[PDB]
Amino acid sequence: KNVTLGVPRLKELINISKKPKTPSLTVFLLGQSARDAERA
């Protein structure tokens, strides 16, 4: 995966934008899904 970084990312944070260049969502699994690849 690729995520915007450096100056272009700094702009998105201070130029707060409705549509980021590379929106992302880090999801953490709660139950047995976290420790089981099949269940994940």
Closest to DNA by CB, 16 vs 30, is 16
With beta carbons less than 8 A apart as the criterion, state whether 32 and 12 touch.
no
Interface with DNA, residue 24, by CB under 7 A: no
The count of C-alpha atoms lying within 13 angstroms of the C-alpha of 27, restricted to the half-sphere facing its C-beta, is 7
Interface with DNA, residue 22, by CB under 7 A: no
Interface with DNA, residue 32, by CB under 7 A: no
Angstrom distance (rounded) from CA 24 to CA 5: 13
Interface with DNA, residue 15, by CB under 7 A: yes
Residues in the site for DNA, rule: CB under 7 A? 15-19
